[PDB]
Write a protein that binds this ligand. Structure first.
Ligand SMILES: Nc1ncnc2c1ncn2[C@@H]1O[C@H](COP(=O)(O)OP(=O)(O)OC[C@H]2O[C@H](O)[C@H](O)[C@@H]2O)[C@@H](O)[C@H]1O
Length: 235
């Protein structure tokens, strides 16, 4: 029981990544190689002219992706879970991740007992194509977030990336933390995420191959695609 997850986790750890594929809950996973970068995705896109706020950086544009997808399908080192402080699961992407990873994910989460807002903890990925899950707890906005809550949201992304770094992982996908059940406005969240990932990549670009913005609703897809050229200029 309380070593079930331990055994499975350690077991999957030894498998080659195409041995792992047989164990994935899905057969339609998305390999990282097939996820295009922002440098590629920006070819042919009309950037409406603006007062510039960032320098174009080819190399940083190679390390961020925006993708509309179910995040459980991404074959990356880690997907980030928009969790609750109890790590019990829930009806948003937390529920998709728990169902796709399996009941053994729940058992590891029980040993981690809680997660504070703006903080993060890592578990194994189990049946998920992703090797690990980084669980973080966003602020609960109730429509109109406070400045301290804008800081908590930024802090979920930084604590998540800090854990990536400590565990020497190089690919991660993020869902739109706090914007579902926790009610953060989608526009204000994306401004914070994009500013945060740019500055983080300025300082740590050598340590990762890809940060992925995994959006789920068209609304966030539209929001992010329109703000990406401001934070990651291409011309
Ligand atoms: N399968 C999916 N793949 C990727 N993104 C998804 C998926 N399903 C939903 N999203 C997007 O994920 C984004 C985040 O929405 P939410 O998941 O509510 O998270 P929160 O931080 O606001 O609420 C956390 C609470 O609810 C939780 O269940 C926890 O247990 C907590 O109790 C939205 O844009 C979704 O469209």
């Amino acid at each position: 029981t309380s070593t079930d997850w331990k055994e499975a986790k350690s077991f999957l750890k030894g498998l080659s990544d195409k041995q792992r594929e047989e164990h994935y809950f899905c057969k339609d996973f998305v390999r990282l190689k097939k996820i295009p970068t922002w440098k590629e995705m920006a070819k042919g896109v009309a950037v409406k002219v603006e007062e510039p706020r960032y320098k174009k950086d080819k190399q940083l544009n190679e390390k961020i992706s925006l993708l509309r997808s179910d995040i459980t399908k991404l074959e990356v080192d880690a997907i980030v879970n928009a969790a609750n402080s109890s790590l019990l699961g829930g009806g948003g992407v937390d529920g998709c991740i728990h169902r796709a990873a399996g009941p053994l994910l729940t058992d590891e989460c029980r040993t981690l007992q809680s997660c504070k807002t703006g903080k993060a903890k890592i578990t194994g990925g189990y049946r998920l194509p992703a090797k690990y899950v980084i669980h973080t707890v966003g602020p609960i906005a109730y429509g109109e977030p406070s400045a301290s809550q804008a800081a908590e949201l930024r802090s979920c992304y930084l604590s998540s990336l800090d854990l990536l770094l400590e565990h020497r992982l190089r690919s991660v996908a993020f869902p739109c933390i706090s914007t579902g059940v926790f009610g953060y406005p989608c526009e204000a969240a994306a401004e914070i995420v994009l500013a945060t990932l740019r500055e983080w990549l300025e300082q740590h670009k050598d340590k990762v191959d890809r940060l992925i913005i995994c959006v789920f609703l068209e609304k966030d897809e539209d929001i992010y695609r329109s703000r990406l050229p401001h934070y990651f200029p291409v011309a």
